[PDB]
Amino acid sequence: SIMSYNGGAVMAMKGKNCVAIAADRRFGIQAQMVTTDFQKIFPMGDRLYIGLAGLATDVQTVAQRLKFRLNLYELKEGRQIKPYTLMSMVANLLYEKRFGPYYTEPVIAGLDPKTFKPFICSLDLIGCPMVTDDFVVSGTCAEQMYGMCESLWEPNMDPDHLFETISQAMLNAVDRDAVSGMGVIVHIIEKDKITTRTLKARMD
Amino acid sequence: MEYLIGIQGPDYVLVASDRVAASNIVQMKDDHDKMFKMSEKILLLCVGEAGDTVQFAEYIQKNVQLYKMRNGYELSPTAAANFTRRNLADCLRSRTPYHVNLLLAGYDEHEGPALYYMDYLAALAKAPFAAHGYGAFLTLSILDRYYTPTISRERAVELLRKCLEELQKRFILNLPTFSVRIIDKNGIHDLDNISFPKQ
Amino acid sequence: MEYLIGIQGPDYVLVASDRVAASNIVQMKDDHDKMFKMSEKILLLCVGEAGDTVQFAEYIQKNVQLYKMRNGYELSPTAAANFTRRNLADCLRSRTPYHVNLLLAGYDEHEGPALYYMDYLAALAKAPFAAHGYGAFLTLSILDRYYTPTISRERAVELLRKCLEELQKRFILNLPTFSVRIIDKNGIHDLDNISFPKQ
Amino acid sequence: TTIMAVQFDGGVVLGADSRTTTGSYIANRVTDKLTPIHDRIFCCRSGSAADTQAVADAVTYQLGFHSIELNEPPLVHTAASLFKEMCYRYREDLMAGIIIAGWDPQEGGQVYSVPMGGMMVRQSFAIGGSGSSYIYGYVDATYREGMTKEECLQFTANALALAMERDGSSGGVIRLAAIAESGVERQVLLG
Amino acid sequence: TTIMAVQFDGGVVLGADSRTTTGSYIANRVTDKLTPIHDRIFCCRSGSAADTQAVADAVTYQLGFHSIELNEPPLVHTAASLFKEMCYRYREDLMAGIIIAGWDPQEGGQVYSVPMGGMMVRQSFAIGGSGSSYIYGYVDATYREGMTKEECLQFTANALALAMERDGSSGGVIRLAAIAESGVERQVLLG
Amino acid sequence: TQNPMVTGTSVLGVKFEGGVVIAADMLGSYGSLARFRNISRIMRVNNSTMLGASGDYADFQYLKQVLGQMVIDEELLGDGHSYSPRAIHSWLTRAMYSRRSKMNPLWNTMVIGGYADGESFLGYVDMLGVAYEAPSLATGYGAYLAQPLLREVLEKQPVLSQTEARDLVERCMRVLYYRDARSYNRFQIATVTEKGVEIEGPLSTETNWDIAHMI
Amino acid sequence: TQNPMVTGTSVLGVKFEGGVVIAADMLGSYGSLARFRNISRIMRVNNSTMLGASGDYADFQYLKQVLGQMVIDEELLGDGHSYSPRAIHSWLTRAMYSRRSKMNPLWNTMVIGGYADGESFLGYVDMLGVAYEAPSLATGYGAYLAQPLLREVLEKQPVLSQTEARDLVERCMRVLYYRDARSYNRFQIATVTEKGVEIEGPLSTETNWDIAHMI
Amino acid sequence: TTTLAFKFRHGVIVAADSRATAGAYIASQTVKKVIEINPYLLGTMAGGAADCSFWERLLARQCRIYELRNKERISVAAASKLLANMVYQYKGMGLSMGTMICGWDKRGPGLYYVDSEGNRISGATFSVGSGSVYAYGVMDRGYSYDLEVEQAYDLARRAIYQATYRDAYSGGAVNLYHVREDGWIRVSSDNVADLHEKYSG
Amino acid sequence: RFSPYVFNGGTILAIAGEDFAIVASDTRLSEGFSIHTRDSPKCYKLTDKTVIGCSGFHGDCLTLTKIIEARLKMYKHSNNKAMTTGAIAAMLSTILYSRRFFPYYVYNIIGGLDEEGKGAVYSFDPVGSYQRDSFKAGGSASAMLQPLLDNQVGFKNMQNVEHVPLSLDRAMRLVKDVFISAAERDVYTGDALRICIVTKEGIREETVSLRKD
Amino acid sequence: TTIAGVVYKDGIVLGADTRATEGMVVADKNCSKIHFISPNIYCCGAGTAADTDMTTQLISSNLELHSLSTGRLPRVVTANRMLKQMLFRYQGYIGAALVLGGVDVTGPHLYSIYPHGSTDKLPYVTMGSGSLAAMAVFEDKFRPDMEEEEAKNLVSEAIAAGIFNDLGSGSNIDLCVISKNKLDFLRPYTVPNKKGTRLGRYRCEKGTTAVLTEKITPLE
Predict the structure, then answer these.
(1) Chain E residue closest to G214 (CA)?
(2) How many CB pairs under 8 A join D and E?
(3) Cα–Cα distance between F27 and F9 in angstroms, integer?
């Protein structure tokens, strides 16, 4: 579909006291790939990232408009942004284009700015929020990542098992996926530090 | 249809257009020029619907000249790339959308050489070498066969001549003469025009 | 689509197809032959849907030889041309039509040389010089100013050269190599393969 | 257009309008919409004209042949079966509004209905035609079980009168039929 | 679905079924299909639902404001004119089955009809709705000029009874409305 | 109006010596159902001209409203000047043309009959703005059916009396009752002379059905 | 049949202890007009099986004819062997599949109920050949509407009595009378046991309307 | 989907991928595409699985009948002609089939290319599939007639690696077949990841 | 108008073991947004060493099952011996291409033992191609089940994980895990599970429930 | 999606099932379909999720404004009027299937809204895709002036029938009771579907995945 014009696959998974977001690396037109370095995970403040999947135009455009409104909010008020606030902001921005819709499925993954409470949520192409506790996925491939995460997820996970679980899920679901592949980037964040690893994915 | 290829080096960007301005049966103009010298270190190529290409030349060329005359210092290539992407993304959803295919060649004093890649759906890309049309396919194969990031410029000219000799053997188009530029620490240096007698 | 020319002389017929067997992007075979030597003085050229070309050549080329074996002699070019036209006109109003574009080149003992011209709707024509495809929009006017009925064969080969030189200057397809036949009082003689280095 | 059959105790009573229309123009101002097939069995037709004429002629053929081979008077349900088969088998091309009625020596008066589908049902009264819906509105109000012949005639008179008055496609003239054990009595109410 | 309005000498009598359907599924078994606007004027609606609800609200607004600026009781023809204007203005988008009736001090009982187009006419009786063709079949058969109140009640009872019985969209239950010089008398019946 | 809901039908009008007679019937059919079998389809404009229409009855009500407003305005000027029937014809044509030019056509077919200052007038207005004068006008199917009767007698005799014209209108309406499916046996005659405007009552026709006794 | 002209509506069947009860109504609606308000939509096959159908009534008549012919033929074999209900289910399934394969679908939805040799049977046949066994079947809108009642009571109690089943069918048919636009307050109950096949008469329902006195 | 075939001095090289998706969804990574028709013929699977499979099996049956009637092996061009004649009878009815006919002839090396559109042609190099153009590029870089054995192996293997690297509809194991004068032999079946580790540096 | 197909959904699993072929399937037959039953086992036991499962359009599944049984009996009554597994696979491929231009809308998985006595799973497609794989997940839940089997059966995308041959009982608990995990997120799956085991000694069946929504 | 409404002898009992699927796959197992409007009025949604959410938040904003400006408890009929006027203004483009309930000074009032703008007052409504099963259970066992526990059992039974029919929810039921005085709101009402335990620890070991590029960024 139009969601499968440039591909895309974003997974975010809630751990015990930490949260891990991962995406694919491929960018290209319908079957002809172009590059492997296309960024889909953005830093929106500290210890809180957003992921975007779908049409890459809307990806970059929504990321820049969100950055615009985010900077204006954080300069009117000296504190940084809470995750629910960002979720409502993204929902409002998408629902402004109720009938000229952007083709994207944002995924917000971040921590509490006061406590170490993890948070995950996803949104639809018109601004439907959905908070859960285990994992959210987006992009062209869905059912693969649903099957893997419903296979492997446990409730209370140290960051290493969290990292390995999201690793196996992304690798298997992307290797079964066709139009989205060519590498994995993994952000595993927590209260203390931010880690960014890339996996040896199959370049096929 | 036609294609204008651009390669990234250590300190140079090797772009190469064509000179074909055909309309649906016949080659009307055999010495067309698709190279838009925006500033002293920033090139621009354009492919698409030819009523739109001239007006992108107008808009972007004259507007970046406006920036230069206003402030006092030449743009970075990255800001120019984003400015073009923003203008396409704005003109996309309207009653008048623009359907072109760009790729940007620049060189900063601090960032060094840079090569970008547009689309008719306005996606930025930071690539080592690009593709549009069908010259896309039959260049990208060999060009991804032979690449080294630490490649000297005469090796790149040799690779490009070899790639063109592979082009002029399995197309269905004509493509006789290809104009070629290069960007260095100095500026836009025109190389010799690269045509080929086939048989 | 592709090209083939059909120049008649006083006592010779100079036909020349191409050697291109492309599929929509790439040139799969650059030495292909579209020539079907029917008899010792009758040639046939075909253009169109490449599933129909081989089939209709397989029909005619293996029916005229049957006539040859049965009767002990050879058809006229006229009757062969009309027989092909008859088979097209019968095949057209069916569930399986053929979409081909022929021209027949013959040589009688009595009528001498002869050229016919088919079409995808099965029309006979007794032409002095016919063509087909997109080239045929140019290469007939490149010819109709330098045609003389009493022209010698070296002038005719020169006029082929003069015409191909104007073909490969303003035409979007590639067409690198043309094969050339000639008919005489003896039979079918193949002249050399006419290719061009362009630039 | 609007056709109608009503049975009573002795026999049945039929009835139709005349006007055959095409588009908004009337081609024929007066038309025998009801047709004799056997001498005791009628049918009134609607929908297309040509289709129903052809079907009625074929039924006339088969039914007369069969009745001669029996050397007995035919049944009404048999002709109902014949229209049923001819309609249902070679449907998807026909517009049949066929109503079969007639008196029978074994069974008295009966009325069968064949709509555009091809189903067969036995009814006591029946409508048919595009402008039949309105008098179908009140034929279930005015009807009383156990009428006489004159009550049925007045009944269908009022019915077809309001059908002709209200719907644009109906109109023309009233033709009535009275089929019983005794004979066949046709008459034309006009004006 | 089917709405019915009869005037008599003293006043008018309205009436409807309920059964608001969406496709083949009944969404509402019981529905107020008749609407008070002023204290003496009703309107009963058909066609789509949301169109008629919004139109009834806007008419209620403008009419009440106008009648308070007169400091006089409104005419029924005034409300009919308002429906005419606001239905002809957006006739490309609405499906109006509006029938307005109501007693007036200057003019007695009156009945106006507004069909899907936007024309406005005065009638002595009115049908409306998709299941209205049948009782339209015999509303010119049973009606007699110069009825009483009870005759109009019994009349419309039989009308809506047969409409609900025959048509599949109609049904549910009968709502009646008695409007006169005296008061507004509504009741719910079944039978 | 894209889809006409409630159509009228054919309108007949013809001049005579010092007057114009128009007669159209009283039927408000919807689809094929004659839903409104008692309506008026001729407006009596002030003293000279007179309007008759077919097509969408609601649009005819709208034009009735606007023209009544215009005529009352000019009469309240008090200047002694009224509209000619030809001015009415011109205004109606311009209105219809500007209405169709915005692709929202008024589905109508109108006849303007007027007698002013010795000369009769009989004008036609179509939906597309097609407009002309004629000694006899027939709308709808009447242009197919009763128009040859008018053009037969007017070729047989170029002038007429009021009696002859009224009889001819009666016969044409009888014919339309015979073979028009959207016809009805109740019509009203309107007549203008210099004595004013006069609308006759809902007359009926006399029919024949003696062919029905043939098979 | 591409276009079903005269449709029936939903059929309800459910097993119980040593018997199967099937009940549908007696309505022949065309479009929305209830044109044939007295028809029988249940065939009582020979001794054990029993058929109920929906959709186009003409196709039901046709299949009624063909099945009657075949059952009469095996009864004229005179051997003592009959058709099991599941055999009829198989034959009807193959028939429907052969019809839809040739792009001539028989627009129906049929229910087969039979009791033979200790075992009950309640079969389903679609137009598309989808065919299965079930403890309770519901066609048309009944699969949306009365199916939850069946699946509630059959989950809460796996076996039943005849009285429980008959009462439950009565309740389900009352509900279908409440909220279905193609329904009618006249239905027949048909019940098979080992004692034979029996079709009860045109029963009706008891309604309630006390919600209408609320606003 | 990317297949290629080219003949040279030491016979014929045939390699293919093994990825056969379904829309955007990969069905299997290990679909063996090069259908082994005979002990002297090799056919491919180019566009559609069932059509290529079925018609090449029927062609194998036909050729075995021919050999049993003439006590003699069929030619390559004969099999291409038979396949073209069988495929041509369903023109327009929606068969996609772009296979390749390889094998050793009485004339020697034989390489034909038969379409569902019936483009029956000989040639020296071919490449079929979605990513076929990539194979054309890198092969017509590296192609000659006078190549060696290991050289030709590397050429074909590198070609399929580049094709699966750029295009998305290709991947899985890279099979490798080699037609000699007497019989065909499977060379090897290599995975993409092994080649990536081997050839990336 | 009349559309000749309708999507019933379903889920068929197969695992080619060393000397066992495990085929399992749920027994929910649905249509659109309704539930027709909670008992319709997709599996069918042909021979003592062959089990076939059929999903997709259900009527074509029934018709195909009956035709396969008929041709099985024809082969037996002609050639005095049962078929192999691959012979059945080839015959099914011939059938599915024999209705090419009016296709079956049916996914098919034939498991069973070979003539050596090893597991053999033959996948299929609507048009009639086949191949010998180690596992396939057919029907609606294909994408929910293929990557987990790629992780567990194939040991793929793993590092320093040696290859143990899949035992019987471990495969059993794998099938139970994947059907619970797939019945959580899929709508066309649940209400039972019919587990068929082919050994060197016969066919075993086993029914394990699921969640009832 | 199967939302229901009922009116017992004092107030309103609202229920819901909270499986929000996107196409064919269960996307959510817990989705709050019962939204806040006011301290006396609630609402449930069906169909397009985000349209219902944005519309119900806009109406709740407007009613909070109007109530705080007035200074007394709001009216259900005003909410009904705002919703029907807005949805009729959007010409039926916005798909929002709404159930509106609240207790005014006049008592309990239930309204069902169909997304074109047609509204009805009923003593019991069911909306959504699986609405027909709950409508079946209601038309089976409704009687006027039921009790508290009677109505709660009824609504639970209706939505349970909707869940045993298709497109219900694994979510166990959301309920809500609004009275003249006591507002309650109950998320985990009764769980029928316990997920079965795991049969195998499929644990990813610490180091089974090849890493190409590590990166550490400290924080505060």
Answers:
(1) E30
(2) 45
(3) 8
DSSP string covering H101-136: EEEE-SSSEEEEE--TT---EE-SEEEEETTHHHHH
Residue D150: count of CB within 10 angstroms of its CB: 11
What's the full length of chain D, in residues?
191
The CATH number given to whatever domain includes residue C90 is 3.60.20.10
User: In sequence order, what are the residues at sequence separation of 6 or more whose Cβ sits closer than 8 angstroms to the Cβ of residue G53?
Assistant: G8, G11, G41, G60, G63, G108, G109, G110, G111
- Nearest 5°: the CA angle H151, H156, H161 is 120
Torsion-angle region of residue E172: left (phi > 0), alpha (psi -120 to 50) or beta?
A: left
- In this complex, which chains have at least 3 CB pairs below 8 Å with chain F? D, E
Residue E35 belongs to domain with CATH number: 3.60.20.10
Structure tokens at B120: 């008719």
| Superfamily covering domain J1-220 | Aminohydrolase, N-terminal nucleophile (Ntn) domain (3.60.20.10)
**Best mutation target, G168, G206, G214, to test chain J (most J CBs within 10 A):** G214
Q: What are the C-alpha distances in Å from C70 to residues A154, C64, C66, I115, J142?
A: 87, 10, 6, 59, 96
DSSP codes of every residue in H3-44: EEEEEETTEEEEEE---EEETTEEEES----SB--SSSEEE-
Q: In which domain, by residue range, is A37 found?
A: 1-204
What six digits make up the tokens of B5?
């290829």
Pairing of strands B100-108, B42-48: antiparallel
Structural fold of domain I1-213:
Glutamine Phosphoribosylpyrophosphate, subunit 1, domain 1 (3.60.20)
Per this entry, what is the length of chain H?
Answer: 201
**Domain coverage including residue E128:** 1-191
Structural domains of chain F sorted by starting position, each given as residue range(s) with its CATH number in brackets: 1-215 (3.60.20.10)
Q: Please report, to the nearest 10 degrees, the dihedral formed by the alpha carbons of residues D48, D54, D60, D65 taken in order.
A: -150
Binding-face residues of D in 130-159 toward F, CB within 8 A: 130-131
Instruction: Answer yes or no: E142 catalytic.
Output: no
On whether the CB atoms of residues D41 and D72 are closer than 8 A, the answer is: no
- Residues D52 and D96: beta-carbon distance below 8 Å: yes
By C-alpha distance, the chain J residue nearest I155 is J208
Locate all alpha helices (DSSP H) within C38-186, ordered by sequence.
50-71, 77-92, 153-167
3-state secondary structure of B16: strand
From the list E9, E17, E10, the residue with the least C-alpha distance to E156 is: E17
If we measure between CA atoms, which residue out of F147, F151, F135, F138 comes closest to residue F19?
F135
How distant is the alpha carbon of residue I147 from its chain centre?
17
Domains contained in chain E, number:
1
Q: Which residues on chain E are in Cβ contact (under 8 Å) with F6?
A: 115, 117, 119
Counted domains in chain B: 1
**Which entry of E1, E35, E52, E156 is annotated as an active-site residue?**
E1
Cβ of F134: how many Cβ atoms within 10 Å? 17
Can you give the CATH number for the domain in which H88 is found? 3.60.20.10
Contacts of C31 in chain B (CB under 8 A): none
What number of other Cβ atoms are within 10 A of residue F154's Cβ?
17
Q: Which distant-in-sequence residues (6+ apart) come within 8 Å of D56 by Cβ?
A: D35, D37, D43, D45, D98
For residue D126, give the H/E element and its range: strand D125-128
List chain F residues with CB under 8 Å of D25.
Answer: 141, 179-181
All residues of chain A having their beta carbon less than 8 Å from the beta carbon of residue B124 are: 60
Confirm or reject contact between E21 and chain J (CB < 8 A).
no
Q: D161 in contact with F at a CB cutoff of 8 Å?
A: no
Query: Can you name the residues that pair with G50 across neighbouring β-strands?
Result: G113
E26–G181 C-beta distance less than 8 A: yes
